[model samples]
Target chain A: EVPLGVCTQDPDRWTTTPDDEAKTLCRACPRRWLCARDAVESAGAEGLWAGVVIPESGRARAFALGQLRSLAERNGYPVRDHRV
Target chain B: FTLLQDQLQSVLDTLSEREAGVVRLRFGLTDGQPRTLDEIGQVYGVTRERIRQIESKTMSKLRHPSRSQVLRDYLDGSSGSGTPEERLLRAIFGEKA
Candidate 1:
């Protein structure tokens, strides 16, 4: 299936969130909510999925974890703690 | 071919005809191409908002533990082969493509 998500449009930026532009685009995308849900299910790591940044390290990583956790709890998905 | 056809079908079978149809179209279960909300709404002779509501409602039903339980294994890394499409299918339908 050809993904209609904006991320798929520019694969180079899919794994890297250099600035707010990519994130903003994701946030406005129609698939954002569903993408976020999938990311939570996948325990999404190291990418820009649905505007949330899944980083490899540092304070942002923890923030991202909490974001995933919150999204999971709200959506009834299983939540797991991640180690940095 | 759908990798987890039966598994995905079983869960979707629980839905009503329109619900099932919309979900299938939206996620591209029958066809590889997922349809836009506007497209689906046009097919159903309804507004985009109506289609969205139906899709959202069906998803909520699918998310129930009883409905989603059988499909949760795809969430783990061990269950699926390492392919982006497979992973995407598993993430959306708890099965591979």
Candidate 2:
């Protein structure tokens, strides 16, 4: 209700690597992971994830999830990837 | 408010009752709704300032080397799950306030 607001509503414009003003906004996003995760919480979603853009597809979601786990790990966070 | 429940709960278990309660109320980790300092104080029978102290101290503890490192080791994902901007905050700040 407070309009905590997300990076953007435009799915097609989703870019994990948001650049320029977009970079400022998404980089400013506090819940970046949560937002990216939800995009594919469904079978698949079109948007930037962790910083990578994957179209809506089951495989794409899996790829995103895998990448995220690896990304978290790179940052010293051990994330368990979703299984098939 | 979205974070890994298990990890958060595990870390919370190591804290004092008041510390756990303060974080839960302040961050709405338990219920989806977050409580104001005064509201949490009423539950603790303490002043808002005191509540702030407890929460501040507890949160710092979370950032300690061992504790924070454990959380990083246990990092399945941000605790619980979604918000309009909690991820943005977690990113800006290193998962603590």
Candidate 3:
């Protein structure tokens, strides 16, 4: 089965700027994917998995979901309709 | 007391060889006073950032026991059979007193 993961941007530090330094830092991190995988595996079906299914901080959640879908497509994993 | 000791031992057991060394040095759990990230990096022949990364990753495993059930149990004081608060205090304060 294709497993989905969720990752939560730190609530205290979540921001609105699409390309903020913190977000950029997360994106630029070499271990981002590994962190994501761990998040997904750790939560199983609960909480944020690699910042995917559960978007804790509203706007960033949207961005994270989109990112997850994009990642799934690029990785040849079946993309889910994410819309709720 | 047995439970507390057992729990602490369990958490220690969870460390990979490298992670254990980092933990030892970082907190001065062995040998001497706590070592800085830079010092750890120098000893390991890695960059400070790399040392920090290892320490972060390892501590994350400990702090959030979902990553390690034994650790979680120990952190929660289930292993110590003490109140969660007491176990946590001891964990943070070390074995003395």
Candidate 4:
């Protein structure tokens, strides 16, 4: 899929070698909501997934999803629930 | 919590011993204090760059949905913010965030 997020310009900053500015950049991403949903549900790597650092732990990903949902709501980007 | 620790251990189990060790030390998963690549390298007798390579590769492997779903389920149950990722950072590393 085509990523419209700024990370698309330099994915290395989102993975492999995350830059200090990665998450800050994610904050300004247009696709953060979608990215957050994907990150939590897909068990993505430990990097800046949707502006967050997702560890390899399944528990951590689940936790991140919840947090993302909250932030999404606060920012008027509410994430819809995904099926488990 | 032991459950969280055990769940994380399950994911680490998929990695090589070194992979697990590097990830554990880098994230401070067990010790509550994440370490620098150089510090972890000293522990493993390798260059920090090599440590970075291992960490990066291992992290990619760990991200596979099949492996991480276990812990993700745990978080999903909580109905839980702080950029979600930031919350995850604090959840995993506590004050370190």
Candidate 5:
């Protein structure tokens, strides 16, 4: 699995990573879900979590929240913050 | 919990389709609610005990030390190796390889 991309040094690339690479990384990342949750809680925003790319402050709060809501809907996982 | 699910997903990749299905249902491994053995057995036309056996067998394999190496690596934050792909990604993404 790719590293648990807590935050990236290059911000732009993470948002624009190709689908294949993003998919591979999501599959590999152990913190796929947690990274997304953390992004919502403290919006410095990680690079990618699962398949969702947590953008920067300009629009990160909206984008990450949307992505996480979709993920949280899955019954296996307990939901995280949604009102972020 | 999420990390455990991630590890479980990785291990499920190595399991047979039927085995994976049973485990997934039993544990609610997806968005769906977890299913009881009897309910799952109804679909497979088997007894609840049989379903239990299938689940038990898969769990044994999934929890094996070798099967869990991925989680171990993840916990330790170690990438498998500095392959060309990861090296390139490290440069492009600014994450350590």
Candidate 6:
């Protein structure tokens, strides 16, 4: 497995306050790992994962999810492996 | 991440519909560009500083939820790994190329 990644609509671009609320809810969700993986894979397949990692841009979602997957694997938790 | 989520939710809970709308609009927490403090204050008929003050207070409340040491510790580093010292060193000295 290369690494998992994540993304969300920018907090500055949500269409509703509740949408931001939903993003926040997602941030706190325990299942964020899986959600993030799905997001990255979706982005990659669609060629839309550009500018989503830290230092390269403010979108730390990719790095965050990558770290999550690394930690999960280190902890021996079951995780889906998909090459990044 | 958990801290951000909890803080955001707490702020949303305290706002009236109008205030919430302003919050969302001013911060572009929704689909609009984030407004300056002056802009938000003008819309709300308050001083810019007053709007800023309220925003600051709301953020403080959200970030400091529970006030318990354990919760604080948990929140302190919930978003990423590494201690402060380690992070500092990594930033200044580039741990790995």
RMSD of 3: 13.8
lDDT at position B21, candidate 3 = 84
Candidate 2, residue A74: CA error in Å? 23
CA deviation > 4 Å runs, candidate 4: A1-84, B76-97
Name the lDDT of candidate 5.
0.50
Task: Report the lDDT tens digits of candidate 5 across residue range B1-97.
Answer: 4454455565566667888788677755544566889988997889989998776555544432224324434432324444332221222222321
Query: Clashing pairs in model 1?
Result: none
Worst 10 residues of 6 chain B by lDDT: B61-70
Q: What TM-score does the A-chain of candidate 5 achieve? A: 0.46
- For all predicted structures, in order, the TM-scores are 0.46, 0.43, 0.40, 0.44, 0.37, 0.31
Provide per-model DockQ scores: 0.03, 0.02, 0.04, 0.11, 0.02, 0.02
Worst 10 residues of 1 chain A by lDDT: A75-84
Give lDDT tens digits, candidate 5, residues A1-84.
444352232222343333556557556666566544433443233445556655544665476666775665552344443533
Q: Cα miss at B7, model 3 (Å)?
A: 2.3
**Model 5 spans with C-alpha error above 4 angstroms:** A1-84, B1-7, B72-97
Chain A TM-scores for all candidates read: 0.64, 0.45, 0.36, 0.66, 0.46, 0.32
- TM-score top scorer: 1
Give the per-residue lDDT of model 6 (tens digit) for B1-97.
5554454444355544655655565656555366778988888798988887765533322222111111323433432454332232222112330
* Residue B18, candidate 1: alpha-carbon lDDT: 92
> Considering TM-score, where higher is better, how would the candidates rank from best to worst?
1, 4, 2, 3, 5, 6
User: Could you give candidate 3's per-residue lDDT for residues A1-84 as a string of tens digits?
Assistant: 222111123322221122344455555544445444333333212232333334444776556655655664555543433311
Please give the lDDT score for candidate 4. 0.60
lDDT of 1 at B49: 99
